[PDB]
Amino acid sequence: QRAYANVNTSLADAMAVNILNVKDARTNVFWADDAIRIVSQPIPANHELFAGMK
C-alpha cells in the first residue's frame, strides 16, 4: 500500500486546510487526454415492446 503513496506525510489533527480560490475567476482547464471519458449507452426504444411510436 505504501507503494501507492502520493503525499510526503499525513494529516495530523491540527493542520490548517488553506483554500486556494480566494476570488471569483473564470477557470482555464488543462488535462491529459486520457482523463475525461464519455460513456454512452443505447435506449432500446426500437424494441417491439414500444409499438405505436415511430
Binding site: 449507452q41 443505447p42 435506449i43 432500446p44 426504444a45 424494441h47 415492446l49 414500444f50
Partner: protein
C-alpha cells in the same frame, strides 16, 4: 322419434321437436407486464416471462 303401431292412424300424426344447448366463452385469462427502456438491453427476462406465461 316416437312410434305408433297399427294401420288406421287418422289424426294421430306427431309433430317435430328438436332441442338445443347453449355454449359460450368466459373471460380472457390475461398476463400484464410493464418495463422501462432500461430493461430491454438484455431481453432474456422478457423472453422467459413470455414462455412462462404461455
Amino acid at each position: 322419434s316416437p312410434t305408433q303401431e297399427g294401420w288406421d292412424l287418422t289424426d294421430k300424426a306427431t309433430g317435430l321437436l328438436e332441442l338445443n344447448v347453449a355454449v359460450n366463452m368466459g373471460e380472457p385469462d390475461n398476463d400484464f407486464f410493464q418495463l422501462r427502456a432500461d430493461d430491454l438491453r438484455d431481453e432474456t427476462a422478457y423472453r422467459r416471462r413470455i414462455q412462462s406465461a404461455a
